[PDB]
């Protein structure tokens, strides 16, 4: 063991910004890095291709156009081809788009002309699109990491990436298939969801179901892959077909590697198609004839020193893996339970929580997160009790009464604790017909009805509905308290601990602990300087990702959450000597080490894949025990095909009540988020020096009393907007049908068009009671 | 069919005949979350536990009722009109279909009184929507 | 019947099914879902006797399941029902072929039992 | 001519009152609980002893949909 | 965007004949999402389908 990649599971995610640096983004390599950043840009600005358009103008170029008007005084195809390249663009726009964008031009300084006409051409293609968020991959040295790789001259790497897509070739997603599996509990789930039978997995048929045998089966799958080395730095595309070798080409990705020998993956470009034009994708996540450009696979490396060494990074200890996802609309939101935390949980045996030892920097993330999902779900910003409860606090400078782990403040602690759901799911709930066939955990709390209505009286609630307010794997079936989400065993664990006072806290934590935010902003500084980068990198591109509920979620789902698909997973150190924070973990996937070419490669189980499948699987020896030994495209396969219909589909459940609105998973897809319309009318204070302040003239924002300018300001910050209108999704026009499976549809081509959320700074609040760090929802349907 | 008619621009939204088929309606709900002020002496104050009402700012307390008095909901989602439970389908045609039933259930928008407003902003009539739905 | 290669080479794989008008919650309640009749004839007297339960189980529809007659020598005559099949709610359409829910209908099968007394005793 | 057979259908003896009138198997139905039918002791066997409404209540509803 | 759109082919043999063809039968949506479920119109669409003008000039050896 001595050289390994990180992170062990590099994330990827969609858009369709160009993949060059200066207008891409990266998967965060340190948690909570930049969550007040007021700076950020997630979608391609006017100002980045202006910039680009200007550095394409070195050095050669304003001379030989001077030249060109003198051996000019239209062009000409050679002309206009020896401007065009000399010109940097051929990657960013096809030629004859740059060609016949000149072709047209008026001559008769002529720069500016062109440079006008080369502007129009990026900024249709660019602005304002969704900038890719790559990852790059890492190699260490070991003894153990410790020390990024550093090449010297004579020193070489060379990487090797395979990735597939296999969603179009394999079952439905009904359900979790683990809901039903037999298990001694983890950290993650409870066995009393499979032994009470609270949410029973499903059989899933096949998708595309009419390509028989498996061998034509294969023409469902798209893979590619490349290599690169510290020794070309050229990008390479990872391109694949489909159908396998009419056929679209899919392009999955793009790989770079730098002279440090640093990998670089991008994405796709967020296309999905049918076969067939008039194939609707009318599901949420099981629509035949259909491919997207997702995919998942198979990272290694080959160290090569100038002696002759080489060293192969290679076997499950030392590889990583890359799985691409849907963009994330939110990037400073952080879901309430992350991939990470999945992670942590799947190595820990329910029975044995009530040994977990917690610091309040375990506690601290369930309930930051919670407080910052108030910017992507109404529910959270009007509809929470508990984050409520923090304002007030806030509000005294006493958040620090939270970190009170003596007596005079556990009534203060367990009322907030008491509000949260418990995952042993086994709270309000009446046991019915308890001995029968019939036996059933019923919940007495609300229930999320199915769409096929039943005309006779509900049954009233007599328990209070649990937090959070977000639904669960066991959404289909009315009554089963796993209709709703909860955090996950140990951090449940962790919050009882909290509550019953048996947590401890350093000094210095309580001195930076008078508001939430300022709480935060510390603990942001402990993982800054925290010394183990591969490890924070491990975690920073898993922290974003989401944690439940799975059906099937967004990024990944919920094989991920069982300690059997990974080869390592084990606790090294908290973040801080003195301060967890959640941990630092080492882990790894188990792979396939023959990658596109395993057996298994194209292995399912007949008709209908089930949980007795599953089942099978944990025998090693077993022929379902591939299941977890992952080849390209495995990670991937189970999420919604396309995935827009999945993302359409991950909003609002509304209940016969009307509040509060259960979200999906609104932290990466929001459900009502701040407009930049609503963000033009309350940034400003009464003095600005602007001619228009907040919407109003000069003149009749100074005519109002200041009373009056700030409760303006106020309600302009409370109106949300439902994420899903900051694009047309099918509800635009007079008798617009609008509607669930109009947005799934028109999804494929308006995702790269809904509001992007960015922190965005509030200069003077003044009285008005808005935070100096917003997060506003930028598209171009909200803009006004 | 008498409500919103939305453009590619999100706002303003036009509204058909909102004065007697209200679009954007104030909910009970929210009525009952800024209607108190913080010194009423009830064991809940404005949706908040007498304690948590109490021990904030005097500033804050009146934030929360702005707040609570500008979140308008879509007068469509005041009865159920198609757009209720797990993948319902919601949309236009929906609409016209439940409202045979549930328009004996839409939200009716009533006059109330803020006796106390302070210098939260809220006017002492306040124009309240009505139903079932958006009670709580 | 049924061969056995059918489950031993998963030709055919049973599914699971969920419940029919899954928001009524509770065993109790979801005996409301449940039409039921009874009755009685005999051989003194041929007068038709209706087999009428209601739906939801004791708004609410009188759905007639079936009518029963003995005659003169003691044979048992059972008429099924109308074929009235009805949603509680008009605008709920019965678009699947076998799972609607908000519907019923007067199909209906039960236990035919008889009791035999003579002459003298 | 394929024969003349003498079978009757296994029977709860309390009609409308059988504690098993109203059984299921809680949320979702799946051949496990047929396979635990099989053994006459066990709490599915129900399952094979009809009550009123056991033949008809696995058709579809309404009839009229699945006619067609 | 902008689809081409072949509206028909034309030949003439040595004999000064003109040979019209048609379009291939080609229609499509700007957008895959746009459903022609109207007998006679839909927005958003297009066809091949084609009508004009068709005029000569006759030139003999003398001139
Ligand atoms: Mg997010």
Redesign the pocket.
């Known amino acids: 063991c001595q050289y390994k990649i990180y992170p062990p599971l590099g994330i990827a995610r969609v858009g369709n910004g160009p993949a060059i640096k200066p207008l891409s983004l990266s998967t965060p390599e340190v948690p909570w890095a930049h969550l007040y950043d007021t700076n950020v840009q997630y979608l391609v600005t006017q100002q980045e291709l202006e910039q680009l358009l200007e550095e394409a103008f070195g050095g050669n170029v304003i001379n030989e156009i001077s030249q060109i008007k003198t051996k000019l005084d239209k062009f000409k195809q050679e002309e206009i081809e020896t401007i065009t390249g000399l010109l940097g663009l051929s990657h960013l726009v096809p030629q004859q788009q740059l060609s016949r964008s000149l072709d047209n031009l008026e001559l008769k300084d002529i720069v500016q002309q062109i440079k006008g006409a080369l502007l129009k051409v990026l900024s249709d293609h660019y602005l304002h699109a969704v900038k890719k968020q790559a990852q790059n991959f890492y190699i260490y040295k070991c003894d153990n990491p410790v020390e990024k790789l550093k090449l010297t001259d004579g020193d070489k790497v060379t990487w090797r990436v395979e990735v597939a897509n296999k969603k179009s070739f394999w079952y439905d997603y009904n359900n979790a298939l683990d809901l039903s599996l037999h298990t001694q509990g983890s950290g993650n789930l409870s066995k009393n969801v499979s032994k009470h039978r609270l949410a029973p997995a499903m059989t899933a048929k096949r998708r595309n179901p009419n390509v028989i045998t498996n061998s034509l089966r294969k023409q469902l799958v798209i893979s590619s892959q490349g290599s690169v080395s510290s020794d070309n730095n050229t990008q390479v595309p990872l391109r694949g077909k489909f159908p396998a070798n009419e056929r679209h080409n899919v392009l999955q990705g793009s790989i770079e590697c730098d002279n440090e020998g640093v990998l670089r993956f991008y994405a796709g470009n967020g296309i999905s198609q049918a076969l067939s034009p008039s194939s609707l994708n009318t599901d949420f996540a099981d629509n035949s004839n259909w491919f997207d450009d997702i995919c998942d696979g198979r990272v290694t490396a080959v160290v090569e020193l100038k002696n002759g060494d080489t060293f192969e990074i290679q076997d499950e200890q030392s590889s990583a893996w890359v799985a691409t996802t849907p963009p994330?609309?939110?990037?400073?939101?952080?879901?309430i339970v992350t991939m990470y935390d999945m992670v942590s949980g799947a190595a820990l045996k329910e029975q044995d929580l009530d040994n977990l030892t917690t610091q309040f920097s375990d506690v601290f993330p369930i309930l930051y997160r919670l407080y910052r999902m108030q910017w992507?779900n109404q529910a959270d910003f009007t509809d929470n009790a508990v984050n409520t409860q923090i304002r007030e606090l806030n509000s005294e400078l006493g958040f620090a009464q939270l970190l009170d782990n003596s007596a005079s403040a556990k009534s203060l602690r367990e009322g907030i604790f008491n509000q949260f759901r418990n995952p042993l799911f086994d709270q309000d709930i009446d046991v019915d017909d308890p001995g029968q066939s019939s036996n059933e955990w019923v919940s007495n709390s609300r229930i999320i009805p199915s769409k096929d209505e039943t005309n006779i009286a509900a049954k009233p609630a007599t328990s209070s509905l649990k937090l959070p307010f977000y639904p669960n794997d066991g959404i289909d079936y009315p009554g089963s308290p796993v209709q709703w989400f909860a955090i996950p065993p140990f951090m449940y664990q962790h919050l009882q601990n909290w509550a019953a006072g048996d947590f401890s806290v350093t000094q210095v934590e309580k001195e930076s602990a008078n508001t939430i935010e300022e709480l935060g902003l510390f603990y942001s500084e402990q993982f800054k300087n925290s010394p183990n980068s591969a490890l924070l990198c491990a975690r920073g591109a898993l922290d974003?990702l989401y944690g439940g509920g799975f059906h099937p979620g967004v990024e990944l789902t919920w094989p991920m959450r069982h300690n059997l698909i990974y080869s390592q997973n084990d606790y090294v150190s908290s973040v801080t000597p003195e301060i967890n924070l959640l941990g630092l973990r080492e882990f790894r996937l188990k792979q396939d080490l023959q990658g596109l070419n395993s057996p298994n490669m194209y292995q399912d189980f007949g008709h209908v894949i089930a949980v007795d499948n599953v089942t099978a699987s944990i025998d090693p020896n077993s022929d379902a025990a591939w299941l977890w030994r992952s080849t390209p495209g495995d990670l991937t396969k189970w999420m919604g095909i396309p995935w827009q219909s999945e993302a359409a589909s991950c909003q609002a459940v509304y209940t016969p009540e009307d509040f509060p609105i259960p979200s999906w998973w609104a932290?990466?897809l929001?459900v009502h988020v701040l407009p930049l319309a609503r963000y033009n009318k309350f940034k400003d204070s009464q003095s600005a020096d602007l001619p228009e302040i907040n919407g109003m003239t000069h003149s009749i924002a100074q005519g109002m009393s200041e009373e009056t300018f700030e409760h303006l300001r106020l309600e302009q910050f409370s109106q949300r907007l439902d994420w899903l209108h900051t694009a047309d999704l099918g509800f635009v026009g007079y008798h617009a049908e609008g509607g669930y499976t109009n947005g799934l549809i028109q999804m494929v081509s308006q995702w790269k068009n809904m509001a992007m959320?960015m922190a965005r700074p509030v200069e003077n609040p003044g009285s008005s009671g808005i935070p100096n760090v917003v997060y506003v929802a930028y598209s171009q349907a909200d803009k006004d």
């Open positions: 994330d609309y939110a990037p400073q939101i952080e879901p992507v974003a932290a990466n929001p959320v």
